[PDB]
Design a binder for these strands. Structure first.
Length: 50
DNA sequence: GGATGTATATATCTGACACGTGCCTGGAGACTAGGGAGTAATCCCCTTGGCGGTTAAAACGCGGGGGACAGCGCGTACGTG
């Protein structure tokens, strides 16, 4: 609505984070929501590929 | 009849003790000041019991091969007179 489609950050506990991921998959499927967890190489993969 | 082993008595060594003496250093008495005990406040560090998540280090198993150890020879360096 307000065209503020810039970078947003949501900081959640790790145990509830699948319960946020499926909520983003269900309610806002057109959004480019990404997940940031894992070891050094997975975060590097997210950093330089996405 | 001559020579030999043992037994009590007296002089000498030898560390310890009684007495003497100096003197100086420790003790008795009085006074004082300050060092340390006690109190209160404030703030930071440590204790004991929990939780969550990362992850690198610790634990375990197994092959193998390098090294510890035992045995044997030798010759020389050290023991002995």
């Amino acid at each position: 609505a307000r065209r503020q489609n810039g970078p947003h950050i949501i900081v959640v506990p790790l145990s509830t984070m699948p319960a946020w991921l499926d909520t983003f998959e269900k309610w806002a499927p057109d959004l480019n929501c990404i997940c940031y967890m894992g070891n050094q190489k997975s975060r590097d993969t997210i950093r330089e590929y996405e």
